[PDB]
Design an enzyme around this catalytic site. Structure first.
Site, mmCIF file in Angstrom:
data_model
loop_
_atom_site.group_PDB
_atom_site.id
_atom_site.type_symbol
_atom_site.label_atom_id
_atom_site.label_comp_id
_atom_site.label_asym_id
_atom_site.label_seq_id
_atom_site.Cartn_x
_atom_site.Cartn_y
_atom_site.Cartn_z
ATOM 1 N N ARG A 77 0.725 -1.100 0.034
ATOM 2 C CA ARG A 77 -0.155 0.075 0.150
ATOM 3 C C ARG A 77 0.742 1.158 0.233
ATOM 4 O O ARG A 77 0.743 2.251 -0.838
ATOM 5 C CB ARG A 77 -0.766 -0.022 1.472
ATOM 6 C CG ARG A 77 -2.181 -0.590 0.827
ATOM 7 C CD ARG A 77 -2.189 -2.281 0.552
ATOM 8 N NE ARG A 77 -3.604 -2.757 0.596
ATOM 9 C CZ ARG A 77 -3.500 -3.980 0.184
ATOM 10 N NH1 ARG A 77 -2.602 -4.841 -0.255
ATOM 11 N NH2 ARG A 77 -4.657 -4.427 0.139
HETATM 12 N N1 LIG Z 1 -5.276 3.241 -9.615
HETATM 13 C C1 LIG Z 1 -4.091 2.312 -9.134
HETATM 14 N N2 LIG Z 1 -3.316 2.065 -10.057
HETATM 15 C C2 LIG Z 1 -2.144 1.202 -9.843
HETATM 16 N N3 LIG Z 1 -1.877 0.768 -8.617
HETATM 17 C C3 LIG Z 1 -2.893 0.885 -7.673
HETATM 18 C C4 LIG Z 1 -4.078 1.542 -7.808
HETATM 19 N N4 LIG Z 1 -4.705 1.706 -6.585
HETATM 20 C C5 LIG Z 1 -4.286 0.872 -5.769
HETATM 21 N N5 LIG Z 1 -3.105 0.523 -6.297
HETATM 22 C C6 LIG Z 1 -2.505 -0.385 -5.559
HETATM 23 O O1 LIG Z 1 -3.535 -1.184 -4.684
HETATM 24 C C7 LIG Z 1 -3.228 -1.404 -3.395
HETATM 25 C C8 LIG Z 1 -4.218 -0.873 -2.491
HETATM 26 O O2 LIG Z 1 -5.225 -1.895 -2.416
HETATM 27 P P1 LIG Z 1 -6.734 -1.531 -1.699
HETATM 28 O O3 LIG Z 1 -7.297 -0.486 -2.285
HETATM 29 O O4 LIG Z 1 -6.328 -0.983 -0.271
HETATM 30 O O5 LIG Z 1 -7.679 -2.809 -1.559
HETATM 31 P P2 LIG Z 1 -8.590 -3.172 -0.338
HETATM 32 O O6 LIG Z 1 -9.885 -2.245 -0.431
HETATM 33 O O7 LIG Z 1 -8.811 -4.528 -0.059
HETATM 34 O O8 LIG Z 1 -7.902 -2.534 1.093
HETATM 35 C C9 LIG Z 1 -1.816 -0.341 -3.204
HETATM 36 O O9 LIG Z 1 -0.692 -1.153 -3.118
HETATM 37 C C10 LIG Z 1 -1.827 0.306 -4.271
HETATM 38 O O10 LIG Z 1 -0.230 0.484 -4.676
#
Ligand SMILES: Nc1ncnc2c1ncn2[C@@H]1O[C@H](COP(=O)(O)OP(=O)(O)O)[C@@H](O)[C@H]1O
Ligand SMILES: Nc1ncnc2c1ncn2[C@@H]1O[C@H](COP(=O)(O)OP(=O)(O)OP(=O)(O)O)[C@@H](O)[C@H]1O
Ligand SMILES: Nc1ncnc2c1ncn2[C@@H]1O[C@H](COP(=O)(O)OP(=O)(O)O)[C@@H](O)[C@H]1O
Ligand SMILES: [Mg+2]
Ligand SMILES: [Mg+2]
Ligand SMILES: [Mg+2]
Lengths: 470, 512, 48, 53, 55, 470
Positions: free
Chosen positions: B371
């Protein structure tokens, strides 16, 4: 004094009602008025002066209210040089018709594991003579070894080979423990041990002890027979101080035995029916089998994989306690490869560039990488042949077959099955054999000449002869 | 301080020792079995309160029923008997915390098992404490260097996050943890408190021989001076394996609340679930799916959620968690692994195939993710890290066409080869951590395509020779990248010029 | 070419069917074990 | 008296300190440069390395 | 000329760093023993108190 | 005066012994003598003046016989503009450390859903700025919206974008209820809204409410904190006819939290261990989130799919209550496309030729059929390749890839990860862009430019720029 009285009999679990001075947990109780004396180990205090115990012998013939005497101490089995060459029972009784065992002291089968301060590494390789083992998962003396295999895969035959190669030439004492196995092997092993001169009736010989918990015993016996034999091994480790070879037959029966009685003890079943104390109960038995500053115990433990399900809780938890691992695959047996050792599943802590020679490490990874790449293509190889396969990939597949066939070798104990004499492969020959094969020495010869061969030079002689006749 | 002055203060301290004893209620055990003790009476007892048996072993009162009390034996329950006395201490479970913990090995309860001497500590914190709120936290903006090329480059870990080391048995899960502890030793020697990271290793359900080998390696490399090892072996009762994770976690909160940085490493949590499941089943509680209790999810969530980055108002401390999970057959769809993945931020997937194909550390970059992302990496790393991911992504695609063969475009051959250099570059031996600045140089040469000249088999050794050549001749370059933390244009030209030059200097197989 | 190709697809489709049928048995076997596992969990929870 | 009583440096205790100083010297002088190994085979350079000290 | 002039210069600093590091290590190393002697002396005092209790 | 008293404490479930006038179910009970305010929600009447409740705070520190006070009403939380721009607890406590919450009155978290006669349903397009969403799965103002996603798929980041795009510039208020998620994300969102000026310390501002039930909270609280946030939105709806934007984080934690205590409550586990009242417990919440005559609520709730198994009972039942559905696929993330919105699985009740313009409906299905055809070709392309396909199929695969890559859109919340500034796409430009691609307007340019672009014109400009660059 017979302060206890049988309250209720349910299979192998028997409750005893006492008037006062309840026995401690794990204490041994003897029922009175029954031939073939029955021993009962205390397990729980149900309250109201009622204690729940497990039966070691058949409970048929017991009557509610029958008196029970309290010994006040856990099951104490005889230990010392007298047990050498003698067969003992789960409760220390001799079943070899050889007379009373001469033991200096009687140690309890229940004891705490060695502390953290008393621990030794003993990182020394143990040459067993098996090239496939010494190459991928080399065993190290003083460490824990685990043999995983299904029903009828070559676990017993593999144990017999190790005993012939290691136990005989071994200097220190040895201990053989059978848990829930066919009694025929116990008899054949005993007579075979006498014929090989490893054990004799003459005092001062037979540097090996025998323990048997064969299937004929009821639950509770197969779950504590290991502690009996293990106690005989701890004596030689601490008191004698010499090396010890603790041969342990299939141990899954121990865990299974606990599960067979856990339900009767009122325990809630586990995920797939096992007992909730599987980890702790197994751990107490596993933490005691370890090398310390006093002596080393090289334990070869067989693990029966139920229904070939390696994900089962019992075998899965055992991997964490083992140093060297040798997983047996049934697929190899169908192909005729013996010993049916899975090189990609046989892990060993002894395999590292710093402990063993760097050359041995490179040759090991060379074979693993070769077979691993070939394994990644078996799927497509099944649908369609290797003709359409790429040249580089065909070379990997071709050479992989040569190495796979060369891993198999005949055993001396399995000489009657196959009908060919066994082979003992030295470590230097093992490394040199695979080193030349990976380089592409015997690639021109057919893969059949490497089947059941001891050394690489032996396969070339057979492969060269096959080319001469045609 | 003069010897006489210190001795007087020592004597005065021994003089001021108070000991008060008050009436403590006691009860009798109705039954005892499998470590569970049903106690009669013993009313006005608090949940989780500590109780002492006749022998001297402690117990935790978990089930408070109107009829009896369900207590768990925190040790060996052979001496316990029906009707024995059980005295309530009056304090919730706690463990000693402080700086003296470093360099020792304790158990789940906190007793030192090294045998050196008694623990000289005066601070004791509760094992289970409410996690920080929303305001005390802070955005993670500090890198946590593990020493691994693939990790520090593709899956950067910032101080204050939660990364999951998930894999199968014998896949290098422990190898990653050891390499991290070894890397932090260098920062400990140099006087940079802002980068010191205290390491805490929690061993749950592990053979003592393995932990013994683990501690010896730390002493061998002199990395035990800043390491804390909590041991909850298999022979230890299930409650010990259940409290050891939280026990070590409380030790980390000490450095956290004190503005310091601490790294806690929880070993396989599946073993905790078995001990927690065992502890729950023996208490006659209704089991859930897979025989586990219903609130098993709350267990790991409560434990991992404490790791956070405290704001500057409380000292700016941070606690980083690296929980480990062991999979049976690489199936991540199971109940426990699925939950842990959703709790942590990122997860490191270990593949058995990659391990045997020579890819060690066997890391699957396709699934691993973080993240924090580039928010933790340094300036010199983000620039090179971005392009590295794209190059590796394409290589995984062209992997299939390699089997197809029969033709290869000029560019595809380059992309195929270029990716092969990176894979060979990310490989790393065991017990060989690398400095952050050194990785930037090697990772830089890979993406730029200079590694495409020499043969792949010579790339691994080129790494060693190149780094050694840099440390000796080009020492000012490393200092700028370290202090400033950015790869200036002047360094790029110098670095871009020596990498092709060095390859021609050293004796390598230039034929691609 | 067309002759050997046709024969190759026949052998390939043949082998593809045999493997597909073998996995079907394991799928049904796994299906029974799945119902068995889940059903015991419900009974274990209903017992208490 | 506290000067010596507090810190009773024994002969062997100070001896170890002296050996480290000598060890540091021998390491600093005997440390020879590490260039291309199989290329610095000239009679002159090899003579210097032998008498490096 | 400039290659040897720069060599002796940088080598001079390396020698200076070697001496100051040696003079500092010997001092810190000696301090380490000094603290150990103090702890051992005080440890004996605690050991004497424990023995008095046993008596 | 406390009438009840603690009698039994096991885990999170606590039983209270009352003397008379038992409290109704769902009532809030206050335990006296606790270091922190503990509230117990009555759940079942076990008879003999016994009641079983669930603790909202940690049960550690409680004591049998501790007095318990009866409030006579369910858990009441502060409502009104005072909660706008402030974090609140499950029981109404301000955990933002900004002081007490000023509320004109207190409403209960339990209430009956609005009747059917006064439903007053309405459909109105919601331009969220996302082209893939506004085209394939249009959202309806005042209708539920579901974001089905697995572990680490991008559903959390997508919610942040919707807030950045929808919450701001909204006349009405907004509510954010985060239940069961990690606390780290909560602090980030709080600082984000503060920097984005969505929330502020100055009174009369911050037209947005925040509610957090993060993992740090124990069971029971995570299952009822969601109701607290809903009560805030219900107040802004009924008392004022203002459109409310309810941004609900992952809701699976709600059903999951109930199962964590369902066992201890006495319920028999379900097929997948969930509580038997899964449907009813979820129905009571979904029926309350709907538009009425007084006001409308546009709820954006995310559904976490454990193990990417859409057949789980919890999400399966949720599909029936949602108006618009957004199913996230993990395969797209592997390709780099973001947002990873599954075009085939994602559906919208507004996707009707009568509701939306026929042109919009036509372009939508045109893309769906194009992608569906391309997916079937993947099988044959794997063995034979794109070359062996016919000219008709080649164009299908060509345009399909360009459309699939063009669906990727970089948003403001993804800048830190990708490094490209976010972009907003209008509905008119969105429909016109894809409509042109279906006709072959961009079939000439490479497929590389149709990646992470906002409008078709931006892709064409980038294509020409790449030409002059080389
Ligand atoms: N628009 C995006 N483009 C490329 N990578 C992304 C993007 N959004 C998130 N990532 C990756 O997704 C991950 C976060 O996932 P997340 O939204 O927190 O899922 P969850 O809702 O299950 O917690 C991050 O490591 C981030 O680097
Ligand atoms: N990066 C590596 N480089 C070289 N050797 C390695 C590496 N990783 C593991 N090995 C070897 O694998 C064995 C130990 O693997 P390791 O303990 O690190 O994985 P693990 O997942 O923690 O195993 P387990 O689950 O049983 O605890 C050793 O033989 C080690 O030498
Ligand atoms: N080394 C071997 N070489 C050739 N055949 C073998 C070998 N070992 C076993 N076989 C065959 O495998 C069979 C099963 O071996 P065994 O060890 O008895 O399995 P189990 O663990 O069930 O006792 C033997 O009956 C024997 O006929
Ligand atoms: Mg056998
Ligand atoms: Mg490990
Ligand atoms: Mg999320």
């Amino acid at each position: 004094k017979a302060n206890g009285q049988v309250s209720q009999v349910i299979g192998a679990v028997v409750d005893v009602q006492f008037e006062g001075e309840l026995p401690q947990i794990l204490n041994a109780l003897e029922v009175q008025g029954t031939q073939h004396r029955l021993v009962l180990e205390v397990a729980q205090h149900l309250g109201d002066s009622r204690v729940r115990t497990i039966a070691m012998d058949s409970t048929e013939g017991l009557v509610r209210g029958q008196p029970v005497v309290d010994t006040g101490l856990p099951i104490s089995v005889p230990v010392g040089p007298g047990t050498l060459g003698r067969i003992m029972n789960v409760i220390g009784e001799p079943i070899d018709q050889r007379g009373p065992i001469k033991a200096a002291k009687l140690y309890p089968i229940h004891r705490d594991a060695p502390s953290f301060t008393d621990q030794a590494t003993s990182a020394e390789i143990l040459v067993t003579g098996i090239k496939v083992v010494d190459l991928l998962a080399p065993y190290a003396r003083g460490g824990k070894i685990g043999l995983f295999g299904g029903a009828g895969v070559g676990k017993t035959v593999l144990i017999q080979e190790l005993i012939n190669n290691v136990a005989k030439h071994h200097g220190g004492y040895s201990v053989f423990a059978g848990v829930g196995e066919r009694t025929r092997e116990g008899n054949d092993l005993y007579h075979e041990m006498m014929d090989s001169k490893v054990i004799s009736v003459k005092e001062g010989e037979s540097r090996c002890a025998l323990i048997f918990g064969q299937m004929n015993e009821p639950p509770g016996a197969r779950a504590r027979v290991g502690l009996t034999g293990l106690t005989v091994a701890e004596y030689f480790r601490d008191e004698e101080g010499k090396d010890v070879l603790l041969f342990v037959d299939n141990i899954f029966r121990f865990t299974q035995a606990c599960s067979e009685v856990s339900a009767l003890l009122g325990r809630i079943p586990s995920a797939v029916g096992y007992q909730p104390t599987l980890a702790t109960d197994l751990g107490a038995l596993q933490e005691r089998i370890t090398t310390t500053q006093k002596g080393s115990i090289t334990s070869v433990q067989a693990i029966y994989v139920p229904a070939d399900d390696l994900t089962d809780p019992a075998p899965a938890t055992t991997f964490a306690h083992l140093d060297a691992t040798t997983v047996l695959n049934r697929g190899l047996t169908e192909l005729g490869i013996y010993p049916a050792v899975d090189p990609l599943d046989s892990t060993s802590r002894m395999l590292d560039p710093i402990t063993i020679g760097e050359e041995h490490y490179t040759v090991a990874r060379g074979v693993q990488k070769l077979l691993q790449d070939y394994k990644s293509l078996q799927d497509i190889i099944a649908i369609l042949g290797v003709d359409d396969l790429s040249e580089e990939d065909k070379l990997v597949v071709a050479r992989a077959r040569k190495v796979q066939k060369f891993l198999s070798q005949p055993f001396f104990m399995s000489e009657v099955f196959s009908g060919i004499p066994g082979r003992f492969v030295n470590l230097k020959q093992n490394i040199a054999s695979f080193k030349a094969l990976l380089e592409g020495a015997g690639d021109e010869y057919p893969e059949s000449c490497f089947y059941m061969k001891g050394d690489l030079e032996e396969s070339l002689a057979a492969g060269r002869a096959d080319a001469l006749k045609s | 301080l003069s010897t006489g002055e210190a001795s007087v203060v020592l004597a005065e301290k021994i003089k001021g020792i108070t000991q008060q004893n008050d009436i403590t209620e006691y009860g009798t055990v109705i039954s005892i079995g499998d470590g569970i003790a049903r106690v009669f009476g013993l009313t006005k007892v608090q949940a989780g309160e500590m109780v002492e048996f006749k022998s001297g072993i402690r117990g935790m009162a978990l089930n408070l029923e109107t009829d009896n009390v369900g207590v768990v034996v925190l040790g060996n329950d052979r001496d316990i008997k029906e009707g024995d006395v059980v005295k309530r201490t009056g304090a919730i479970v706690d463990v000693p915390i402080g700086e003296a913990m470093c360099g020792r090995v304790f158990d789940a309860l906190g007793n030192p098992i090294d045998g050196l001497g008694p623990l000289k500590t005066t601070q004791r914190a509760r094992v289970e404490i409410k996690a920080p709120g929303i305001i005390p936290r802070q955005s993670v903006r500090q890198p946590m260097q593990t020493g691994i090329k693939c990790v520090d480059s593709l899956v950067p870990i910032g101080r204050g996050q939660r990364e999951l080391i998930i894999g199968d048995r014998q896949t290098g899960k422990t190898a990653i943890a050891i390499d991290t502890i070894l890397n932090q030793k260098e920062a400990f020697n140099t006087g940079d408190v802002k980068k010191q990271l205290y390491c805490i290793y929690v061993a749950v359900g592990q053979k003592r021989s393995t932990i013994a080998n683990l501690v010896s390696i730390l002493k061998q490399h002199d990395c035990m001076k800043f390491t804390i090892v909590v041991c909850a072996t298999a022979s230890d009762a299930a409650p010990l394996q259940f409290l050891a994770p939280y026990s070590g976690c409380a030790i980390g909160e000490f450095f956290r609340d004190n503005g310091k940085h601490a790294l806690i490493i929880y070993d396989d949590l599946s073993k905790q679930a078995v001990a927690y499941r065992q502890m729950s089943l023996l208490l006659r509680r209704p089991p859930g799916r897979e025989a586990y209790p219903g609130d098993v999810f709350y267990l790991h969530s409560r434990l991992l959620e404490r790791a956070a980055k405290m704001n500057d108002s409380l000292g700016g401390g941070s606690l980083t968690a690296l929980p480990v999970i062991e999979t049976q057959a690489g199936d991540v769809s199971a109940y426990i692994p699925t939950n842990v993945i959703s709790i942590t931020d990122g997860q490191i997937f270990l593949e058995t195939e990659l391990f045997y194909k020579g890819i060690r550390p066997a890391i699957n970059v396709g699934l691993s993710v973080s993240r924090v992302g580039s928010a933790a990496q340094i300036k010199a790393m983000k620039k090179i890290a971005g392009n590295l991911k794209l190059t590796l992504a394409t290589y995984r695609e062209l992997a299939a066409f390699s089997q197809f063969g029969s033709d290869l475009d000029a560019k595809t051959q380059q992309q195929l080869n270029t990716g092969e250099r990176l894979v060979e570059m990310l490989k790393q031996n065991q017990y060989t951590p690398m400095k952050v600045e050194e990785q930037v140089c090697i990772i830089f040469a890979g993406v730029k395509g200079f590694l495409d000249a020499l043969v792949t088999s010579e790339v691994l050794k080129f790494e060693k020779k190149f780094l050694e050549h840099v440390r000796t001749n080009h020492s000012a370059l490393l200092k700028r990248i370290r202090d400033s933390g950015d790869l200036s244009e002047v360094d790029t030209n110098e670095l871009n010029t020596i990498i092709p030059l060095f390859i021609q200097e050293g004796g390598f197989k230039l034929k691609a | 070419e067309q002759a050997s190709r046709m024969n190759a697809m026949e052998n390939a489709s043949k082998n593809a069917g045999e493997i597909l049928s073998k996995l079907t048995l394991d799928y049904n076997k796994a299906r029974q074990a799945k119902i068995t596992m889940e059903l015991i969990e419900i009974i274990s929870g209903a017992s208490i | 008296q506290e000067q010596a009583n507090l810190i009773g440096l024994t002969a062997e205790q100070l001896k170890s300190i002296k050996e480290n100083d000598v060890r540091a010297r021998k390491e600093f002088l005997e440390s020879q440069p590490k260039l291309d190994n199989n290329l610095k085979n000239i009679e002159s350079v090899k003579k210097i390395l032998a008498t490096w000290g | 000329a400039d290659s040897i002039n720069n060599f002796l210069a940088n080598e001079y600093l390396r020698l200076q760093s070697h001496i100051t590091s040696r003079a500092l290590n010997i001092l810190k190393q000696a301090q380490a023993y000094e603290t150990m002697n103090q702890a051992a002396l005080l440890q004996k005092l605690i050991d004497d108190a424990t023995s008095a209790i046993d008596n």
